[PDB]
Amino acid sequence: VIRNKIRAIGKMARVFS
Amino acid sequence: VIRNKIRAIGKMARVFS
Amino acid sequence: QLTEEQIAEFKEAFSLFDKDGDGTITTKELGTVMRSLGQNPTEAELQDMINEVDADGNGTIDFPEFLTMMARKMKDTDSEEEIREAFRVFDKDGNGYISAAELRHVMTNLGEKLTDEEVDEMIREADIDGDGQVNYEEFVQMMTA
Amino acid sequence: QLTEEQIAEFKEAFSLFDKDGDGTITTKELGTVMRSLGQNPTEAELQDMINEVDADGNGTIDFPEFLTMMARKMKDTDSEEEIREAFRVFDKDGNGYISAAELRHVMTNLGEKLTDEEVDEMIREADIDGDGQVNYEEFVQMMTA
Ligand SMILES: [Ca+2]
Ligand SMILES: [Ca+2]
Ligand SMILES: [Ca+2]
Ligand SMILES: [Ca+2]
Ligand SMILES: [Ca+2]
Ligand SMILES: [Ca+2]
Ligand SMILES: [Ca+2]
Ligand SMILES: [Ca+2]
Ligand SMILES: [Ca+2]
Ligand SMILES: [Ca+2]
Ligand SMILES: [Ca+2]
């Protein structure tokens, strides 16, 4: 789940910049 | 259609480089 | 329909924002994620972000409003990235400006059949600041309207 | 399924490569585009690229093979970008290394409850070079594992 969280944040990082 | 081509170029740049 | 997988990705994203699990995203929650991403938005910026998608006027973001926000931002980000990449392809010397010669040589290499005069016209039209070459901001203008 | 607009985009992308319009992409053609993208592949490297997707073994790329190439490269690009952005999230000071302190902080942001021992374990497992920090390469390995 941790790795899922990490991927999720990376996705969001690109969308929100 | 120049702009469509430019967009394609950008897309390819992203996925190859 | 979205695939079940697609929907799952959006639910995951929603969950990342909805810190307290109540079904809505507040400015506090929004700000939390933004900060976690290394940004530092003002309270006014956060309110504005919500306002843009807050169809029901309750000052929070529910799931369908969040879809709108995501959709918009994903489209914009994708477009921005593509345009930026294309800029880089044309700006061969990496000086931050596309010249007529740069444009001409790339286009030709890539199989287009534009005359020298047509390339010059492309530059002329896009060069809205009048300095002779096309910078990134001008390139964006050219590509978006 | 596929939308008309999607297909249009893929046709435009294919045409960028298939300069002569013969419905196949050659090493020659592939190389020309790669150079415009700022690379400098050799013939053998270009042949390798084609071989990865050359379903019919004819030595060149047709439209369905190009679709496979794109599907793969899009997925890979996306994944790589996600991981890279995540790395930047973790590496708060921008020094190129994730410290145990940084990791602990981010795990707390993300609302993953960890004990001290757990964070250490996490670092220990990803830390190939024994420096007690996680560099990019290490992070990528941890994430593709
Ligand atoms: Ca909430
Ligand atoms: Ca409002
Ligand atoms: Ca609302
Ligand atoms: Ca230049
Ligand atoms: Ca003509
Ligand atoms: Ca004019
Ligand atoms: Ca200018
Ligand atoms: Ca061809
Ligand atoms: Ca083939
Ligand atoms: Ca660091
Ligand atoms: Ca290390």
Numbering used by the authors:
A (entry chain K), B (entry chain L): 395 to 411
C (entry chain B), D (entry chain A): 3 to 147
Article, verbatim:
Calmodulin (CaM) is a calcium-dependent regulatory protein, able to interact with a plethora of target proteins having diverse functions. CaM consists of N- and C-terminal lobes and a central helix. Upon calcium binding to the four EF-hands of CaM, a hydrophobic pocket opens in each of the two lobes of CaM, which then interact with large hydrophobic or aromatic residues from the target sequence. One example of a non-classical mode of CaM-peptide interaction has been suggested in the case of the calmodulin-binding domain (CBD) of calcineurin A (CnA).
Synchrotron X-ray diffraction data allowed us to solve and refine the structure of the complex at 1.45-Å resolution, much higher than previously obtained for the CaM-CnA-CBD complex (between 1.86 and 2.6 Å). We have shown here that while CaM forms a 2∶2 complex with CnA-CBD in the crystal state, the complex is of 1∶1 stoichiometry, with a collapsed conformation, in solution.
